[PDB]
Amino acid sequence: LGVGGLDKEFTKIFRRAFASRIFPPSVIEKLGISHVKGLLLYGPPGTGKTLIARKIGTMLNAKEPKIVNGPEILSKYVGSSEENIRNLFKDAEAEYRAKGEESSLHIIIFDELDSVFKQGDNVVNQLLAKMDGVDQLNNILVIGMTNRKDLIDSALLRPGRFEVQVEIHLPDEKGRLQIFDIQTKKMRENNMMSDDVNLAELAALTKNFSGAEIEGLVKSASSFAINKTVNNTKDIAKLKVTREDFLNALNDVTPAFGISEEDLKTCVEGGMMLYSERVNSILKNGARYVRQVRESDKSRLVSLLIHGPAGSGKTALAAEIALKSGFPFIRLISPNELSGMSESAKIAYIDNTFRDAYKSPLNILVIDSLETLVDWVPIGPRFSNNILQMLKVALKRKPPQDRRLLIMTTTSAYSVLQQMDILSCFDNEIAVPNMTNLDELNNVMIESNFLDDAGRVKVINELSRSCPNFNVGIKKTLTNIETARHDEDPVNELVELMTQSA
């Protein structure tokens, strides 16, 4: 018909909101019931709600549905906004007086309803008067659409007002396979598509797209082919799209609910070298925890804590573990996102990230430098309590309806966290120590291409008796080598720096 991926939500709507309209009024009045005048649809944007609303009416051959926007009403002058509501229902009032109860069905669509409640009341009262009060009108059917159900006051959900509610979900694999066919029907119908394109492969490559994203993907793929000929020319009739066009167009559309690849990849990883036996164990534990949350239905929430001294390599390990998992959804919260905001904005952003995290089969969240997010300074001590409470409540909530996520958080102030008494929110703890032997330094120098062995041996020979038990991190060790490489006497300068660092 034009819709795809919605089959158990199409029957439920039709059974209740439209089944009684088909039969003649005689039998309906014989039973002694009344028609429904409300319907609510909620879900993420770009999923196909207005499409359902417009497509359903075609079966009943009703009038073209009118459309109104909440912010449109809010932004106008007070008097005009007050007057518009009565103007909206004029034709329905006229038709009822004209033709009694045998009038045709009229549909009114109200979009972005929640905006009215976000702070207005005149609009709500006038709207409810036409459908519940003694001015009851028996021709209308109102459709409501919101992205947040929890903001709608319970007064509107009692019987007689918006009596039926439905939810729309992101499409699954079969939904995407159907949507691709629906979108490319006309293109295929005119022999303008190559025969080497397989829609099954595309159904799997596009992993977490919504309905709207596929349209843009197809449009970009078509544009790729169109631009191939211009500069207006002959033989346009031989135009054809190809698999390579789709593959290249896949690089221009980045979906929401996707991977923030740029940050995790560049900002967080500038090398990775195995210099000790502890790193392998840490990575193996990370891989095991990743596997546990993909093949088990008794664990839908796992949280960790990676602590240690400063400049040890926590964030790089967390990012490395996250990158190799392969989950569709990955995000991180770090101080760089929250710089320059006010407290309320920070709370709103933190809440919104978690709220968006509850709409995918699998998810991963990273929380970097927890002690900085709270503005901790030991002189007072001074810190923000509201953010701490929000994080404490959030780190233990379970996602709804058989969904699962994995949280990894880093810190360097273990004692401070122990004082605040929020150490019971975590399921396990991992420690990252410093370097404490010359063999690890030798491995690091070898793997960084410092210089030939003849020069490498001398540094260790001198440091053996100059400083036996140095205790330095990896981040500073990788910085000393870089600056010593540029000196005129690298061998002595590296030892001089390392002695001070210890």
Give the number of other CB atoms < 10 A from CB of residue 489.
Answer: 9
Residues 183-212 interacting with ligand ADP (rule: CB under 6 A): 211-212
State how far the Cα of 439 lies from the Cα of 67, in Å rounded to an integer.
Answer: 73
Considering CB distances under 5 to 8 angstroms, the limit depending on partner class, which of a copy of itself, ligand ATP, Mg ion, none binds residue 272? ligand ATP
| Binding residue for ligand ADP, selected from 12, 23, 51, 431, defined by CB under 6 A | 51
Q: Is 310 among the annotated ligand-binding positions?
A: yes
The reply on whether position 315 binds Mg ion by CB under 5 A is yes
Tokens describing residue 430 = 């991992």
Is residue 241 involved in binding ligand ADP (CB under 6 A)? no
Shortest gap between Cβ of 104 and a copy of itself (angstroms)? Answer: 17
Does 49 carry a binding-site annotation? yes
Give the shortest CB-166-to-ligand ADP separation in angstroms: 13
Stretch that binds ligand ATP, among 185-193, 265-273, 413-421, 461-469 (CB under 6 A): 265-273
Contact 106, 62 (CB under 8 A): yes
Return the closest-CA partner of residue 105 out of 60, 68, 137.
60
d(CA 279, CA 27): 76
- The three-state secondary structure class of 135 is coil
Q: How many residues bind ligand ADP (CB under 6 A)?
A: 16
With beta carbons less than 8 A apart as the criterion, state whether 138 and 35 touch.
yes
User: Whose Cβ is closer to a copy of itself: residue 16's or residue 63's?
Assistant: 16
8-state DSSP, 156: G
Q: Report the largest interatomic distance among the alpha carbons of the chain, rounded to a whole angstrom.
A: 106
Please say which residue, 76 or 278, places its beta carbon nearer to a copy of itself.
76
User: CB 61: neighbour CB atoms within 10 A?
Assistant: 8
Residue 50 annotated as lining a ligand binding site: yes
Quick note: the x/- pattern for ligand ADP over 91-110, rule CB under 6 A, is --------------------
CB of 110 to ligand ADP, least distance (A): 13
271 binds ligand ATP (CB under 6 A): yes
Are the beta carbons of 145 and 113 closer than 8 angstroms? yes
DSSP state of 303: E
Q: Is the peptide bond before 378 cis (omega within 30 degrees of 0)?
A: no
Sequence letter at residue 80 = S
* Token pair listed for 302: 């796992």
Residue closer to ligand ATP (CB basis): 17 or 268: 268
CA–CA distance, 338 with 25 (Å, rounded to integer)? 61
Site for ligand ADP in 6-45 (CB under 6 A): 6, 45
| 308 known member of a binding site | yes
Judged by CB under 6 A, the chain residues 272 through 291 that form the site for ligand ATP are 272-273, 279
Token couple for 133: 């009060």
Chain positions 130 to 169 lying near Mg ion, rule: CB under 5 A, are none
The nearest distance, CB 50 to ligand ADP, in angstroms, is: 4
Pick what 420 binds: Mg ion, a copy of itself, ligand ADP, none; C-beta below 5 to 8 Å, kind-dependent: a copy of itself
Query: For residue 150, which of 118, 102, 109, 194 has the smallest C-alpha distance?
Result: 118
Task: Give least dist CB 234 to a copy of itself, A.
Answer: 13
Cα–Cα distance between 46 and 208 in angstroms, integer?
A: 13
Find tokens 């790089």 and name the residue: 316
| Residues constituting the chain | 502
Nearer to ligand ATP, 294 or 475 (CB): 475
Contacting ligand ATP within 309-338 (CB under 6 A): 310-317
Residues that bind ligand ATP (CB under 6 A): 270-273, 279, 310-317, 412, 424, 474-475, 478
Residues annotated within a binding site for ATP: 43-50, 308-315
Residues that bind ligand ADP (CB under 6 A): 3-6, 45-51, 179, 182, 211-212, 215
